[PDB]
Design a protein around this nucleic acid. Sequence first.
DNA 1: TAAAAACTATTATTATGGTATTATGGCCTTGGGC
DNA 2: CAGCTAATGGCCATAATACCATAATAATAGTTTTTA
Lengths: 493, 187, 526
Amino acid sequence: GRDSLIFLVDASKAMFESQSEDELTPFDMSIQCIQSVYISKIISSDRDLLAVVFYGTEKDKNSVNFKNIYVLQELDNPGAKRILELDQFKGQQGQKRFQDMMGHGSDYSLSEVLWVCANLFSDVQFKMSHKRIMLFTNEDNPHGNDSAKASRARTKAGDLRDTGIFLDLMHLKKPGGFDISLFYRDIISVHFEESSKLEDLLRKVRAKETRKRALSRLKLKLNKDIVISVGIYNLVQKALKPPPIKLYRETNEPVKTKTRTFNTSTGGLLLPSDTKRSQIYGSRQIILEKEETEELKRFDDPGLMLMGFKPLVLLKKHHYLRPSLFVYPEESLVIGSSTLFSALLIKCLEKEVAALCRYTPRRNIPPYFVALVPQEEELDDQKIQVTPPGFQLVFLPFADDKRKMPFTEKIMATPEQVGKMKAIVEKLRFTYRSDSFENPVLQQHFRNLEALALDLMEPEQAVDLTLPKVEAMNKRLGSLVDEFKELVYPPDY
Amino acid sequence: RAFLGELKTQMTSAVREPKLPVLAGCLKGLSSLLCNFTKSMEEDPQTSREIFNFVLKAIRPQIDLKRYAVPSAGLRLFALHASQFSTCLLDNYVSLFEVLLKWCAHTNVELKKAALSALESFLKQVSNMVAKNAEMHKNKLQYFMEQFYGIIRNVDSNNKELSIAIRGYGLFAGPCKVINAKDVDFM
Amino acid sequence: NKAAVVLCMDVGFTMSNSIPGIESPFEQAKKVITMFVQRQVFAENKDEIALVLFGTDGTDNPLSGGDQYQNITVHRHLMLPDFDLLEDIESKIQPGSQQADFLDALIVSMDVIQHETIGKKFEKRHIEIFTDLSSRFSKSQLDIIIHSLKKCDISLQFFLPFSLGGPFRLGGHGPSFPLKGITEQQKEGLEIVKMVMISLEGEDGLDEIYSFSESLRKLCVFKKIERHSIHWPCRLTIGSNLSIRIAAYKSILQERVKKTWTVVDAKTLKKEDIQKETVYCLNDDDETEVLKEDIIQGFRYGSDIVPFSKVDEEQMKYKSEGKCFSVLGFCKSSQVQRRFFMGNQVLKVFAARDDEAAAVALSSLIHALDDLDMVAIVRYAYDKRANPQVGVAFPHIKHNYECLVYVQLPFMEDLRQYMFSSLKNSKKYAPTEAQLNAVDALIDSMSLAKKDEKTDTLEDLFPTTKIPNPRFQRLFQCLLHRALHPREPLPPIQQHIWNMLNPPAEVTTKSQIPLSKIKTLFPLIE
DNA sequence: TAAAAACTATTATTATGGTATTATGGCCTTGGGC
DNA sequence: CAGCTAATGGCCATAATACCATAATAATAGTTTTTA
């Protein structure tokens, strides 16, 4: 449920060495990779557990008590001085000191290493799912000498994949990024792409957050006589942080502050009995029970009702407000809405018609009128899903929505502009994407925490464009905005 | 009196039902509380009274005898003169009395005995002011009297199992001092 | 706002008409008018009311004579509202039946505006004559009163029991009554008011002809007197090329309470006893009290405690400045999805105008957007106090006036996605269509908006809009009830409530036998 | 009579949210014959 | 002075907070079974 993800560096010998190359030991590149995912799960803050281990080496860290290994850490959600604790390992001083202080390279034996790290899959005491491992190697030859080691590769390998446990080798630059194809299968283990490097890892997880989540499950009675139960889902919440946590000063420790009510006149206490929930205006104070309030919500019950069918195009935006998060109607428990819900969306979409509902949130609420667009089902060859089949949970518009908005005259433009304006926008347009879109200015703080995480000087201080780039603005389009400026006006801004 | 209050509340607007763990406690140590009261009067009769009256169906059955364990000691330990109460509400109540009697008694369970207990007991308290009252116990005597009395002869033709004990005490409770105001001579 | 409010009301005989279904017109009158009462308690602003009584049995007014002033009673005086003014509803109101004429209460209402607003500063004013139009109708002083209430800047309303053109709701879903139920006396009065309205604000007022029941269907009185959205100053930057002083505006956004359900005392209600317990503690091993609330500001994350302060926060925090709005770029609308329109707060954005030129060129870029299905990518930092934000913004087009609306661009994290096996795979679920088609025909019978008026305006039963949401309404019933009457159990839910709550039964009836084909053709499991 | 497991059901678990609520949030409004 | 300040009168967004409220799982107990 909260799963496994694993760092590993191969060792024969020369790997922790740089191949005498003048940039880095690709070993070290791997080092910052480890840094990058383990750090990454600071941001993503993933109850997935992470692994740091090496092998193939001089001394050992393990419980399996064999040559050419080191544990680094056991499976973990991260730690600040788990980060720091591993932070020694950059730098040639830290290359070496890391190496020798631990000892660096002698021999190894492959599938031995398999059940090594696998036997870090032993380390699981908890609920995990994903078994995912990464070897760091340029190794062209595991060995030529004992091909019984090779049979051991092709032997235990299939076991460990069959173990559901999956390690691959990303294209880490042995020359050509690798030149080897040949025997390599064993070494390695909703439409997307793949990459050979860490940078993708780096930025991709710079802002990243939770993955496996579906929890509170409501229903929809369609009519009074027929059934569906409805899965509540958050495509997101407009995801925010785990928020500021109380820890006292020098003690550093959680306050375990509590709250109740003393009497605020006499030194006595107060109790929910002793108080109530009031509205007050003018002269009259008026007091009614926290109960009385919470059940004044009551109309029906948490649950949902097909309230009808509407033109989809009937409302585009005259309007908009707090989103649908996405309810997928459950079909395992209640199926046939497999079929029902299926052809529902089929034809209602065909009708450009939608199923209105009155949604009743959890432990009641006052419920509300909200449309449900049938959500279509979009999948390509490898099945990118932009539209998981379902409903758009479409809030209806209401008085408050319209509580105010002005109306007055409008003076209008001319085609003389649009002739240029269009292509002007063609310079201002970009094909956009699903991706690289956020409010990082909050991200920057879990950068600021990446600090104490590594305990270093300045953050990653990475780059997303949520802000426009001038060279392109003044580049592709140019100053034709001048033409527009003096079209109808000498502005002085 | 808070706990009294906010459970008095929780019995109301949540599925018309409190949290019975929470009443089991409220009443539970309310045992000792009452033991210390010296004559509750106003709310508390209704407090108890209610709680038992609402213990009477499948509600949120938990260790289902717990549902029944709530009144189990609940009426039982409540022997007070504060527990001399529905002598206010009796002619009404005794209806309810036997309703609960029949209720758990006939409710197939592993604690009947509680029923029997309070049965005898509040039964007694009845009998006690009965012993102290010609006015409110002569007729209303014969009210409660006959209330049970349907059970008195009810035993003759039926199978009540252990409930036999029941009658005798009521079969006493009828004749206590009572041949004075109401002749038990044939009894 | 800050205003005077003239409620000109008929309680009389035909307002007292015994009528099936929906309540009698004067009953209607205190229902809607007392929802005005509601919303006045729910206005919590400077709004006053002085009352013109007609349909009553008596005359109270500056002049009692004239042959007018007949059946004109002055109950109330324009004042900052108070709860006794709430109580007069609960007290005076009756089926008082006796007749005034219409220009009578019209000129009396004139004076209601006149001398009281004199001495009471009110920027906006209104006079609303709610009457079923049963009388001998004075056409005498009509246009006098009309353009003098123009001098009184009087917007105008009328309520009655009908439309100009499975119950019949008293609120929700348009005109509900047998359409010709109009007594034609009230149709000559209809022409009277036609003249009055076409005279003052123009002929458009014939839609401003309203009923009391539609007065329970709509919000109608809600949009009269009230302030427009206020300028949000900053520049929308269009490229390093272009920056523009503009007015951001909050358009569609979520309501909330008017207060928390004040949690204060019981048995007194006096908040003096009232406050919650700070109660900050130590962490562990008796973990005892700590005082001087200040603590570091930190976390755990992962497996790691995250010691930190508010200091290192404040400093180490990059931000926006105090405000900004900057186009981040543009794109076509093709790849783009409504779900993937995200947010709650929405900005109708109009000009910083007067020097309106770049609002015109703004229109230029607008139709540069609309032709090509083009959407806006814009930073927005709210102005008044210190915040960065960024979001999508898009032009909406409704011919008479248009703006771009700032809204949240759903942000890359924002997509949750599962392993879900395709509904494209029905290979475990298919019936015969022969049911599916039929229940489609149901979907028509249940189509809420079907083409109406032959305006191609498909009138959605449940047509959103002037139909509100409970939480407030629900409470509001709680508010008149308990505010105006002692503690009770659940207050009246009066089904105008549920009228709103539930669609009309011509659709529903048309669902019934399809509601049958559901159960029949479509079984259940579990 | 209990007395045995007993696979069953229960109500127990949060992690994760969403509400709903707090708080001012750094601003727009108020003032007076020189 | 010049114009009255200018912090006064007001205060909306936020972020924060709360309550407050579930599945993801995993338990309880549970009432039957005869046995005795």
